[PDB]
Design a protein around this ligand. Structure first.
Ligand SMILES: *[C@@H]1O[C@H](CO)[C@@H](O[C@@H]2O[C@H](CO)[C@@H](O[C@@H]3O[C@H](CO[C@H]4O[C@H](CO)[C@@H](O)[C@H](O)[C@@H]4O[C@@H]4O[C@H](CO)[C@@H](O[C@@H]5O[C@H](CO)[C@H](O)[C@H](O)[C@H]5O)[C@H](O)[C@H]4NC(C)=O)[C@@H](O)[C@H](O[C@H]4O[C@H](CO)[C@@H](O)[C@H](O)[C@@H]4O[C@@H]4O[C@H](CO)[C@@H](O[C@@H]5O[C@H](CO)[C@H](O)[C@H](O)[C@H]5O)[C@H](O)[C@H]4NC(C)=O)[C@@H]3O)[C@H](O)[C@H]2NC(C)=O)[C@H](O)[C@H]1NC(C)=O
Length: 92
């Protein structure tokens, strides 16, 4: 029985606008699973519909973008290297 496509991994959602005959822009999808190494923590503003969107962790911010501002100024940081994790700094 068909339905959906589940939730792959945090990648790039190739710009469905800039996607021209030679330039397939992007904009990091966002679905790097929801692994829970230690005890799941919270408290960071968020406060969004708790519908399977609170457990997930890590964060992906195009490790290396190639931004191609489109439309009225659509930024896709033409993701050249999306990395889901390192959502902060240690030691420091
Ligand atoms: C927004 O951001 C996007 C990315 O997030 C960006 O798009 C991405 O751009 C990247 C480039 O900047 C691109 O990466 C490159 O991919 C090349 C391969 O592309 C093909 O495969 C991929 C993967 O499957 C596919 O997606 C892509 O469409 C290509 O598919 C082929 O396309 C053909 C038409 O173009 C098509 O037609 C023919 O088909 C034939 C039969 O199959 C055959 O394949 C023909 O070749 C082909 O033309 C073909 O069918 C199809 N094939 C398939 C599988 O479908 C890589 O080649 C390229 O690598 C090189 O560059 C990178 C970056 O610099 C280097 O890191 C890497 O090392 C390579 O560098 C050179 O490598 C050669 C290797 O030989 C070196 O040569 C040496 O030569 C010596 C002497 O002979 C000796 O032999 C040595 O051994 C050799 O090494 C050379 O020295 C190296 N140069 C240097 C300087 O070091 C690179 O990885 C990526 O794929 C894009 N991503 C996407 C989603 O498309 C987008 O552009 C951005 N947007 C904007 C607006 O900016």
């Amino acid at each position: 029985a068909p339905d959906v496509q589940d939730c792959p991994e945090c990648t790039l959602q190739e710009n469905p606008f800039f996607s021209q005959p030679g330039a397939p822009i992007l904009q990091c999808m966002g679905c790097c699973f929801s692994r829970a190494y230690p005890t799941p923590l919270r408290s960071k503003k968020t406060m969004l519909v708790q519908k399977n969107v609170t457990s997930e962790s890590t964060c992906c911010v195009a490790k290396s973008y190639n931004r191609v501002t489109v439309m009225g100024g659509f930024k896709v940081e033409n993701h050249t290297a999306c990395h889901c994790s390192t959502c902060y700094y240690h030691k420091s």
